[PDB]
Amino acid sequence: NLCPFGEVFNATKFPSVYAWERKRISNCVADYSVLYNSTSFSTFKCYGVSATKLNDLCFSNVYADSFVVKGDDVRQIAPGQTGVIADYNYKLPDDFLGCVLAWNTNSKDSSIAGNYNYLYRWVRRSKLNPYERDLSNDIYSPGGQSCSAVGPNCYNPLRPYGFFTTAGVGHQPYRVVVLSFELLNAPATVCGP
Amino acid sequence: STIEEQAKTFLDKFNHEAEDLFYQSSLASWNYNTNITEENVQNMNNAGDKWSAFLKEQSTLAQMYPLQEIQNLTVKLQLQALQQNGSSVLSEDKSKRLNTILNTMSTIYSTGKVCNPDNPQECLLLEPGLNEIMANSLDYNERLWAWESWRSEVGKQLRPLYEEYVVLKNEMARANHYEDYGDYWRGDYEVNGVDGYDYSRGQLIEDVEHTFEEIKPLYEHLHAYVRAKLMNAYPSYISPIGCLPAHLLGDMWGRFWTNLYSLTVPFGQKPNIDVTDAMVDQAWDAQRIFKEAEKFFVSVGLPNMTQGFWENSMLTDPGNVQKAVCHPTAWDLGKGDFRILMCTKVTMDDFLTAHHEMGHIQYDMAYAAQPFLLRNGANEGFHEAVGEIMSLSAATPKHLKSIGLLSPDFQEDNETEINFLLKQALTIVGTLPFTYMLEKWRWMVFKGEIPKDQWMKKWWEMKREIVGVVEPVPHDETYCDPASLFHVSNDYSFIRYYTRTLYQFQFQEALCQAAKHEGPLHKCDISNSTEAGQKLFNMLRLGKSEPWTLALENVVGAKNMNVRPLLNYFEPLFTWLKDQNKNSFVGWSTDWSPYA
Numbered sequence: 107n108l109c110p111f112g113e114v115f116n117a118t119k120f121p122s123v124y125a126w127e128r129k130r131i132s133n134c135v136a137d138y139s140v141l142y143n144s145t146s147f148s149t150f151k152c153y154g155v156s157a158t159k160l161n162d163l164c165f166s167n168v169y170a171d172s173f174v175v176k177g178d179d180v181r182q183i184a185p186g187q188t189g190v191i192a193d194y195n196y197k198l199p200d201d202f203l204g205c206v207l208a209w210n211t212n213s214k215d216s217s218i219a220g221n222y223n224y225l226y227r228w229v230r231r232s233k234l235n236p237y238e239r240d241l242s243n244d245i246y247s248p249g250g251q252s253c254s255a256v257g258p259n260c261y262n263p264l265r266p267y268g269f270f271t272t273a274g275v276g277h278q279p280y281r282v283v284v285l286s287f288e289l290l291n292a293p294a295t296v297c298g299p
Numbered sequence: 300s301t302i303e304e305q306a307k308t309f310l311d312k313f314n315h316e317a318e319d320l321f322y323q324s325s326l327a328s329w330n331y332n333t334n335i336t337e338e339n340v341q342n343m344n345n346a347g348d349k350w351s352a353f354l355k356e357q358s359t360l361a362q363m364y365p366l367q368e369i370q371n372l373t374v375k376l377q378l379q380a381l382q383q384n385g386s387s388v389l390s391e392d393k394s395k396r397l398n399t400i401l402n403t404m405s406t407i408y409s410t411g412k413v414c415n416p417d418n419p420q421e422c423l424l425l426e427p428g429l430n431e432i433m434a435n436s437l438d439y440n441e442r443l444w445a446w447e448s449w450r451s452e453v454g455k456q457l458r459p460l461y462e463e464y465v466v467l468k469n470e471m472a473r474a475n476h477y478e479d480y481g482d483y484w485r486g487d488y489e490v491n492g493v494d495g496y497d498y499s500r501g502q503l504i505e506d507v508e509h510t511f512e513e514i515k516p517l518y519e520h521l522h523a524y525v526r527a528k529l530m531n532a533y534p535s536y537i538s539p540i541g542c543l544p545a546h547l548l549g550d551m552w553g554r555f556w557t558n559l560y561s562l563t564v565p566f567g568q569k570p571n572i573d574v575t576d577a578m579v580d581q582a583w584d585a586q587r588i589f590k591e592a593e594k595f596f597v598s599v600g601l602p603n604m605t606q607g608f609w610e611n612s613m614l615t616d617p618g619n620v621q622k623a624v625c626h627p628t629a630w631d632l633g634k635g636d637f638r639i640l641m642c643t644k645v646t647m648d649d650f651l652t653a654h655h656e657m658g659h660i661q662y663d664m665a666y667a668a669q670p671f672l673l674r675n676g677a678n679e680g681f682h683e684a685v686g687e688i689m690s691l692s693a694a695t696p697k698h699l700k701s702i703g704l705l706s707p708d709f710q711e712d713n714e715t716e717i718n719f720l721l722k723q724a725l726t727i728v729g730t731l732p733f734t735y736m737l738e739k740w741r742w743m744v745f746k747g748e749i750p751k752d753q754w755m756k757k758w759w760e761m762k763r764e765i766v767g768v769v770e771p772v773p774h775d776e777t778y779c780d781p782a783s784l785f786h787v788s789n790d791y792s793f794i795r796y797y798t799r800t801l802y803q804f805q806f807q808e809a810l811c812q813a814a815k816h817e818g819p820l821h822k823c824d825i826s827n828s829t830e831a832g833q834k835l836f837n838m839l840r841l842g843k844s845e846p847w848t849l850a851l852e853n854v855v856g857a858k859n860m861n862v863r864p865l866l867n868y869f870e871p872l873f874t875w876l877k878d879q880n881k882n883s884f885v886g887w888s889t890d891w892s893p894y895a
């Protein structure tokens with residue numbers, strides 16, 4: 107059985123970073139070679155394991171998380187980083203065994219007038235815990251206080267990205283997939299060829 | 300819930316929104332300037348209107364934040380830049396009156412025309428009719444007619460309006476906690492709150508005067524030299540003792556002395572340096588010119604250009620049906636978009652202008668990491684200075700030979716250097732007194748020292764004392780001569796051109812000192828010197844986030860503007876002029892007038 111590499115990486119639509127989707131992979135033979143003649147990865151970095159050793163390892167459980175981020179913020183998807191995305195949207199633990207893949211997708215996620223279909227959170231009361239998701243729509247009083255209208259110092263937490271075709275390489279969309287696998291005393295699920 | 304913490308989030312919001320709308324406005328403006336249609340004009344006007352409205356509403360909510368409870372200086376700088384009240388403090392009627400006055404003055408300046416008697420049909424505008432005769436003609440009477448006709452059919456209609464203008468502006472200044480409008484203009488150079496790097500608004504005046512006191516000797520000699528040559532051109536019109544008539548100084552107002560070069564060449568048998576023919580021979584295009592400029596900038600350590608610059612810039616005239624403006628400009632649209640717009644042609648002048656514009660782009664590229672409000676130069680003179688030092692470096696014979704554009708057999712003789720130095724002097728040195736006198740007159744009329752009835756009487760007194768230029772026809776009080784220039788009649792400050800000139804020569808000598816140059820400073824090149832590039836980048840990266848005194852010290856090692864490098868640059872011409880002026884008299888007397 108082939109892997110669903112053509113179903114996760116060839117999807118029609120990707121979710122926003124604040125509402126990222128996680129998928130579980132069943133029994134599979136990891137044949138990455140069917141992905142080489144179609145796309146090239148601008149960022150491919152693995153922590154805890156060498157990328158060339160995936161052919162001789164079998165994982166207890168595998169998860170794939172998908173989202174889309176700006177170009178300059180791709181560096182924030184790492185164990186010990188700090189910043190807006192790392193604190194308020196997606197946080198990764200320090201003891202992380204997995205891989206991160208990121209590729210440029212300007213040709214279809216950008217436009218001449220601008221795409222505004224991707225949102226992210228810019229203010230939150232406290233920093234996030236690893237592997238957590240928040241879907242609130244409150245009004246962010248900076249100092250704790252109560253307000254029921256969007257006016258002075260009461261800001262909605264979500265703001266949209268700005269994607270233009272003629273923008274520079276730091277402001278171009280990038281699609282990011284995080285593959286996280288565990289090694290426990292359980293029967294193996296995904297194995298190499 | 301400190302006010303400081305509440306203001307940080309507000310600034311974050313403001314930056315994020317300002318990026319997007321500024322980008323939209325810039326894109327619309329580019330679409331206009333590349334391609335002229337009515338629809339493009341409408342789109343530009345819409346975008347501009349939205350950006351002005353957004354800025355005004357943002358300023359109106361910013362005043363909630365008191366400035367005296369903030370300790371971070373970046374935050375105070377941003378808030379102070381955003382909290383300026385503008386002209387909105389005046390009542391609605393007065394604001395409407397002021398806008399009407401400004402629009403009327405701009406229109407009348409831009410549409411005025413004159414024509415000589417007995418020819419009611421053929422009337423010439425300022426451009427390109429009056430400029431051609433002013434810059435090319437050799438007849439006394441035609442030049443006098445043009446000068447007086449332009450200053451008697453356009454100035455008179457400006458004298459009453461300008462009057463009201465002054466009063467209105469003064470009131471606005473006094474509602475902004477300023478002494479007068481001159482203080483408002485001078486406030487750009489003010490820095491306070493940092494220990495050891497402070498600058499008062501009224502200090503600048505003093506320094507300017509001090510600097511001018513050291514330029515008076517050299518200029519004086521140059522003045523004498525020019526007079527002698529002019530005595531040959533107009534045998535019975537110039538006194539050997541007095542000043543120079545105003546209608547014989549190249550341009551209309553006497554701002555530059557460039558056009559006199561043909562009449563004042565030291566050695567006319569030696570042709571100037573010109574490389575256009577070699578450019579045409581080797582089949583050079585615009586793309587080659589810009590590639591050469593990019594290589595020159597790379598050689599000193601600074602980065603390359605991104606793919607957007609090559610893909611989106613318009614380096615050639617579109618021609619055919621399309622019409623576009625051909626004034627060379629460098630655009631920073633934001634969000635990592637940099638462009639250059641110029642109608643390139645194969646000539647040496649375009650070769651130098653490409654370097655100028657690319658220096659602009661490099662400076663704009665250096666400080667892209669600063670917040671939105673701090674994405675500008677330290678003051679209004681750094682931007683252009685950076686532009687001009689590169690053009691100065693790129694025109695040397697060494698650099699021309701290095702890129703395979705001049706014959707290796709070419710050997711320089713001191714006559715050619717003297718000619719080049721005189722040509723540069725007639726454009727650089729001859730404009731400083733004019734600028735200083737104009738700004739001093741404007742400052743003193745705003746301050747209230749000169750009463751209204753004594754305006755013109757002062758204007759031609761200073762001209763005979765500082766610049767040494769006399770009037771050919773007596774002028775009554777009804778005239779408004781200073782309003783005849785573009786900058787005065789369109790509300791633009793005029794001191795940037797002096798600090799700009801001193802700063803560029805301060806930078807050049809400091810950069811050449813780190814490249815281990817040996818010899819005169821007028822033959823320096825900075826190619827293959829990474830130390831000079833690092834020293835320049837240290838200043839370029841800062842932006843407006845620091846006081847300009849620190850920015851200057853990071854390059855030259857001094858905290859204030861200085862004039863010694865200019866004299867060091869022009870020393871050989873100084874000694875040559877001193878040698879040849881042994882028979883003429885140096886200086887002028889005010890009492891002589893052409894009609895006396």
Ligand SMILES: *[C@@H]1O[C@H](CO)[C@@H](O[C@@H]2O[C@H](CO)[C@@H](O)[C@H](O)[C@H]2NC(C)=O)[C@H](O)[C@H]1NC(C)=O
Pocket residue numbers: 598697698701826827
């Ligand atoms: C800056 O340095 C480079 C590298 O030394 C120079 O390029 C060489 O120039 C010489 C002649 O000046 C040529 O013979 C070489 O072929 C060039 N390339 C190399 C790799 O040596 C360059 O000329 C220098 N710039 C200036 C203005 O002199």
Ligand SMILES: *[C@@H]1O[C@H](CO)[C@@H](O)[C@H](O)[C@H]1NC(C)=O
Pocket residue numbers: 334335336
């Ligand atoms: C210039 O503007 C006209 C106006 O519609 C447009 O048709 C034309 O395509 C434009 N030129 C370019 C190169 O976009």
Ligand SMILES: *[C@@H]1O[C@H](CO)[C@@H](O)[C@H](O)[C@H]1NC(C)=O
Pocket residue numbers: 371372373
């Ligand atoms: C001012 O705030 C900025 C925000 O990043 C911070 O980097 C800087 O250190 C602050 N200034 C001082 C003096 O702490």
Ligand SMILES: *[C@@H]1O[C@H](CO)[C@@H](O)[C@H](O)[C@H]1NC(C)=O
Pocket residue numbers: 362382384387388
């Ligand atoms: C002018 O500015 C001061 C302080 O920024 C403010 O108190 C005053 O209300 C402003 N004037 C206007 C436009 O109301």
Ligand SMILES: *[C@@H]1O[C@H](CO)[C@@H](O)[C@H](O)[C@H]1NC(C)=O
Pocket residue numbers: 597601602603
């Ligand atoms: C600049 O561009 C050239 C040509 O592509 C390249 O060789 C060089 O590595 C680039 N980097 C710099 C800043 O020199």
Ligand SMILES: *[C@@H]1O[C@H](CO)[C@@H](O)[C@H](O)[C@H]1NC(C)=O
Pocket residue numbers: 713714717875
């Ligand atoms: C140039 O140098 C020669 C000697 O090499 C000298 O005789 C001549 O006077 C110099 N030219 C000038 C303008 O001083």
